[PDB]
Design a binder for this molecule. Structure first.
Ligand SMILES: COCCOc1cc(F)c2c(Nc3ccc(NC(=O)Cn4cc(C(C)C)nn4)cc3)ncnc2c1
Ligand SMILES: [Cl-]
Ligand SMILES: [Cl-]
Length: 297
């Protein structure tokens, strides 16, 4: 962390009346928070309703979780809108609990989308089959969103396919479910000290020294590329997170290329996984690299 989210300002232009929201089904829930599908009336200039996503806390939440939701709102307001990120539509900070209104993404999280599309995947129609072209586009859009986050001095800390949403026209949006994810029952989060952490996506310096940087997010992006080109497989298959796992990461063990990864995409993964953070590429360098790969395709 380079910037203190609590000190970031919230623009009151985002303020929306909560009585103009109609809550539907829960899209995701954790121990202290949830994301609900909702209908927002008067969000559009004309008298028309629109589907939105609303993040809110559960009655189970404490002062820490209340501050974390406000900190998330300040970060979203500070960042402003970007094509490759879930965008803020509004918020409710008066007359009740904090509500954060973000855009609805019709295809949901990228991880479940890849798992659902896995069997009909075509490397190279009405069928809407997942292709290598879509995977390259997804890699490019996420690198672009990450380059923008880096440019605003923001560290994601939990970049993974599960924190990517898919919307209209195979458009990816970096998100953070955070408290609206049941990390206690998610096998992708491991007990490490007093926390439940996504260890298989974390850079060694994050694991062993609690250091989160622009470079540690780059490491996670490399893990994300592995998930993407394996069509939603869990990283380090058959390897539990134990003493042997930590020893192997420290001693230089790295995953082999996934079945559908082009050699140039696996080259990015290897550089993302450099033990030296200074030897890893920046998100901007990754964007330029993928750009070249797409044009040459
Ligand atoms: C087949 O699928 C059917 C549709 O299913 C869904 C499921 C969902 F969970 C959805 C969803 N959830 C959601 C996830 C995260 C957040 N909040 C943030 O990301 C806030 N944020 C953003 C950041 C950084 C800038 C990256 N940090 N915090 C808000 C909402 N949203 C929209 N549409 C969804 C659609
Ligand atoms: Cl509850
Ligand atoms: Cl609250």
């Amino acid at each position: 962390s380079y910037i203190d989210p609590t000190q970031l300002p919230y623009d009151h232009k985002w303020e929306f009346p909560r009585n103009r929201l109609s809550f539907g089904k829960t899209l995701g829930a954790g121990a202290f928070g949830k994301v609900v599908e909702a209908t927002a009336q008067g969000l559009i200039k004309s008298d028309a309703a629109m589907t939105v996503a609303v993040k809110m806390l559960k009655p189970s939440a404490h002062s820490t979780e209340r501050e974390a939701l406000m900190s998330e709102l300040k970060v979203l307001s500070y960042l402003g809108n970007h094509e490759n990120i879930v965008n803020l539509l509004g918020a409710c900070t008066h007359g009740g609990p904090t509500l954060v209104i973000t855009e609805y993404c019709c295809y949901g999280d990228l991880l479940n989308f890849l798992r659902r599309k896995r069997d009909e995947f075509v490397p190279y129609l009405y069928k809407d089959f997942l292709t290598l072209e879509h995977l390259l586009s997804f890699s490019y859009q996420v690198a672009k969103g990450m380059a923008f986050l880096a440019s605003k001095n923001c560290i994601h800390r939990d970049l993974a396919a599960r924190n990517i949403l898919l919307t209209h026209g195979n458009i990816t949006k970096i998100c953070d479910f955070g408290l609206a994810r049941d990390i206690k029952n998610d096998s992708n989060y491991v007990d490490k000290g007093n926390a439940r952490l996504p260890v298989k996506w974390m850079a060694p310096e994050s694991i062993f020294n609690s250091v989160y940087t622009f470079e540690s997010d780059v490491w996670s992006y490399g893990i994300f590329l592995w998930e993407l080109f394996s069509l939603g497989s869990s990283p380090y298959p058959g390897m539990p997170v134990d003493s042997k796992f930590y020893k192997m990461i420290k001693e230089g063990f790295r995953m082999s290329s996934p079945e559908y990864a082009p050699a140039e995409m696996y080259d990015i993964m290897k550089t993302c996984w450099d033990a030296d953070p200074d030897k890893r590429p920046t998100f901007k360098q990754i964007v330029q690299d993928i750009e070249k790969q797409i044009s040459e395709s």
